A paper describes a structure:
Named Tric1 and Tric2 (tRNA import component 1 and tRNA import component 2), these almost identical proteins belong to the preprotein and amino acid transporters (PRAT) family of proteins but are distinct from other PRATs in that they also contain a C-terminal SAM (sterile-alpha-motif) domain. The mitochondrial outer membrane proteins, Tric1 and Tric2, contain a C-terminal SAM domain that is required for the efficient uptake of tRNA into plant mitochondria. In Arabidopsis Tric1 and Tric2 SAM domains have been shown to bind tRNAala via key lysine residues at positions 205 and 210 and are required for tRNA import into the mitochondria in vivo. The protein adopts a characteristic fold consisting of a 5-alpha-helical bundle.
Additionally, the Gly241Glu mutation is hypothesized to push two neighboring monomers away from one another due to the extended glutamate side chain as well as introducing a negative charge. Crystals of the Gly241Glu mutant were obtained but from different crystallization conditions, after trials using the crystallization conditions identified for WT and Asp235Ala failed to produce diffraction quality crystals, suggesting a different packing to the WT SAM domain and to the Asp235Ala mutant. The structure was determined and refined to 1.89 Å resolution. While the overall fold of the monomer does not differ from that of the WT protein or the Asp235Ala mutant, the number of molecules in the asymmetric unit and the overall crystal packing did differ significantly. Two molecules are present in the asymmetric unit and the polar intermolecular contacts between the two monomers were notably absent. Furthermore, the crystal lattice no longer showed a helical superstructure. The arrangement of the two molecules in the asymmetric unit of the Gly241Glu mutant could not be superimposed onto two molecules of the trimer in the WT structure indicating a different protein-protein interface between the WT and mutant. Specifically, the close approach of the monomers for the WT protein due to the presence of a glycine at position 241, leading to a hydrogen bond between the main chain nitrogen of Gly241 and the main chain oxygen of Gly218 on the neighboring molecule is not possible when the glycine is replaced with a longer glutamate side chain (in the Gly241Glu mutant). The Gly241Glu protein eluted entirely in the monomeric form, supporting our observations from the crystal structure that this mutation disrupts the ability of the protein to oligomerize entirely. We determined that the oligomerization of the Tric1 SAM domain may play a role in protein function whereby mutation of Gly241 introducing a larger side chain at this position disrupted the oligomer and resulted in the loss of RNA binding capability.
Residue numbers in the entry: 191 to 253
The structure:
């Protein structure tokens, strides 16, 4: 079930093949509760480059 840490985000990144950015999620406090609320600007603020950002947004917006 949903908890306030990072496990669901990590599983999502693994599926999307973007585990290298889990570090960015942790430093930017993009915890599991933020996942459905993520925005391009929030991801850009965590220093994630454009094409990876858009892969993640497309996913959390439609899934």
């Amino acid at each position: 079930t949903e908890d306030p840490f990072f496990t669901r985000g990590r599983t999502m990144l693994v599926k999307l093949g973007l585990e290298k950015y889990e570090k960015n999620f942790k430093k930017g406090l993009l915890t599991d509760p933020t996942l459905p609320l993520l925005t391009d600007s929030a991801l850009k603020d965590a220093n994630i480059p454009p094409e990876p950002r858009l892969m993640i947004l497309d996913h959390i917006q439609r899934d």
